[PDB]
């Protein structure tokens, strides 16, 4: 099946920066034709640790910025919602509606996304066991979702740290397509006090493990200059490095794929 690569910018800092990333993703989509690319960005960071951190420029502005990316580059779009009412307006531009990790248990948010007819991708809560995502998928199907994804983004391991339990990939594959969030799986929640920390040095190694184990796609956040990111500065991947990473995981996927177990 066609490997999915969700990539973009964690937050919509400016429509201009968004298009810069979109142009690169567009270029990569032309090269890696065997990959289905979906552009990602959030119109709002509704769960920053601090009240003083960047959130965004509003749903209206965000949707406008995303629609511009879809129109100018012909790229599929994905963004996350935080409250039920946002599902309808977002569904107009988003091909895949993302459900934040902390909200993976909020029945109404899930139902609101499902009735739009759009694909739904749920970030697995850091408090959730792999086998407990089965009920998450059941809620979505109940609400009309036909295309469902579950994203592995790490699990609470002690304080301010996350661990990736790769056993979750084959477990979750039993009821939905699985995506590996290579970015947030290495973040250190609240690690920097008023902001979360992260270890970029482990992004690549862990993504290699992800494709070796076997998944249906990867999620990666990028930025032209991570150091200047308004969110995920510690984990944003330099845009120039995206191509090399994708090539690498496609190669590892190919050689490992014959050994992928059948569910």
């Amino acid at each position: 099946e066609k490997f999915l690569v969700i990539a973009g910018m964690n937050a919509i800092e400016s429509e201009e920066l968004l298009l810069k990333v979109g142009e690169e993703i567009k270029r990569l989509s032309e090269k890696f034709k065997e990959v289905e690319f979906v552009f990602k960005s959030s119109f709002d960071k509704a769960n920053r640790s601090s009240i003083h951190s960047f959130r965004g420029h509003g749903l209206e502005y965000g949707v406008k910025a995303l629609r511009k990316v879809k129109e100018e580059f012909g790229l599929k779009i994905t963004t996350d919602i935080h409250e039920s009412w946002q599902a309808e307006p977002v569904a107009e531009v988003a091909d895949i509606i993302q459900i934040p990790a902390f909200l993976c248990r909020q029945t109404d948010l899930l139902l609101a996304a499902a009735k739009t007819g759009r694909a739904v991708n749920v970030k697995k809560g850091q408090f959730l066991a792999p086998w407990d995502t089965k009920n998450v998928v059941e809620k979505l199907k109940f609400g009309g979702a036909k295309e469902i994804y579950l994203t592995e983004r790490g699990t609470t391991f002690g304080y301010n740290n996350l661990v990736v339990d790769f056993r979750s990939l084959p477990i979750m594959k039993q009821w939905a397509k699985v995506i590996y969030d290579a970015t947030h799986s290495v973040q250190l929640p609240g690690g920097l006090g008023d902001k979360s920390g992260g270890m970029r040095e482990f992004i690549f190694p862990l993504i290699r493990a992800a494709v070796a184990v076997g998944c249906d796609g990867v999620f990666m956040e990028t930025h032209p200059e991570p150091e200047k990111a308004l969110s995920d500065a510690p984990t944003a991947l330099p845009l120039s490095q995206l191509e090399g990473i994708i090539e690498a995981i496609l190669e590892i996927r190919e050689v490992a794929s014959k050994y992928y177990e059948t569910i």
Copy 2:
């Protein structure tokens, strides 16, 4: 004075809420040394299964809570799940409760703060004790004056929660601390389509909470927990509430002498 938040997990019917409110009222008259606050949810917006009990809606719930408040003169507290619910709930709730999974949703916290009511935030199972300082700051920013932080367990491996009592002293630095004796022993998604829990540890850990030092306790009860529509494994039998309260007041009286300063 010491705060005791009690009631039942969900509003299964105003008839049941009234039965429980009656007992809480009685206890309230028996323990003048305690400030009781009646709690119940008008909606279980985060059940594991789509087929589990959620409630009768916001309308029915707010009405039931009003009845409890008018029929027993008891303060009220209930949780909200989306920003728009803060205003209508504030009309009856003396304390707006923020769910654990939602402790980081800025707009929810701000909506609660804006109502002018007191706010009690359940500490996320994914949150470190010191990470609550920022939660408090958001509320102060939103104009909140009476802020509570509730300890309800931390993720410990899968389908299990552990109570790290070092959190009480730590959180007390920036807010009043409440100990949720009910959910701290629950086993997240333990029964598959529902969460589990071990009631035998409720009392022991509640004693630890007051020995350590907290500003209040949170307890969910039910006439017949066997028939509870939520928190069935952890709901405390109504008849046992009095004994436990008297117990923690006695322990608190002796232990309070050693509570470290802020």
Copy 3:
């Protein structure tokens, strides 16, 4: 039943310092007559993180130092063993033989302690679940142990951190007397790089929880001047504070005891 208070110095730095602590413990035993005191110290720290850290002055010297404490103060003695052969020589002076946390699963070490006829106290490994200590007690009984204790000293919670799951007290009480190690439960394993860290500020609060929940005794490490300790410097309790802590837990134990659940 008579509450047990195991106290002393983590390591036998010098026979002189040992006697200084013993004198204070002796004084407290005279005051708190309802408490059974047992003097503790290790003739060897066989598991320091670094090869450069203090270990001790040998089994021979240690036993001699301990025997001096027992003779001069008439105090019961307890010390830990690391290899099977040490059980015999140690049993000559130790009333209770302690089994290190990392070694709680070493069958031979446990058996060696049990056949001496002495009481045995096993520190619950940081990797052990409360209910898995049942097999630990079974091994000891099999080996002849008639007086067995299980000590709660924290559980691995993420890296370099330990959490105390007080549910372990009533669970473990089902098969053995339970002791709460107020000292090591707040240590940060490997926290200081070549040495473990710790948070002394939580020692008192956690010990209060221990007696409120209900245990059969407490274990506390002390030192005239913690800052100068050769081991457990971050968690050693000032000797002058020992009396106040004991008085406090006896008071909390009394008021809470009527509520202790029956196993």
Copy 4:
């Protein structure tokens, strides 16, 4: 070259050890690109239950290992539990293995180092990746020259282990890293009187190990795991060893291009 440590958890009989050694020898002849080391324990000194299988003693075990080495010319590795065992074991073992629970026992490490043999330390389930730097230093101090650090899971809640693959890159800074594909999926004391495990995850995680980058893999096998006297839930069927080895060599070949420098 790539290291593959294989054999069976316990020496149930030299007859069985020889059957397994034969297969390992065959594979050794098939994969010249790999260095095979035969492993087996002469004693399970840490079983959960007093009634579980330990072995036939140090004497019987060392003799059985000698037979394997002489009859197949395969290098040997076995674990020690007390300091006195290092010398007699060193006579046959090319690599002395240090158990996970004992990774902090200074005298055990020193005794192993003193024999002059290579030493492989199982990373304690209670140890942080960076905490192994000190383990290595003790061995260097004791004169150890060939030092290995093995990843075998970390405590994650109760009766469960999680493999944090960030440990491979971290540990590689101070030693060669081996991935124990067998015990990393075991469930400590999961069956009550015995430990559990999930064999379905052995292969998937072994693939992750080589995709990330390690100097070797550790695998326990058994003709009929159903009849194994230890590691029954995790022992890999002997017939499946070849397929998995070929698989990790292929993945390693492609992935090695991206292994970060030390």
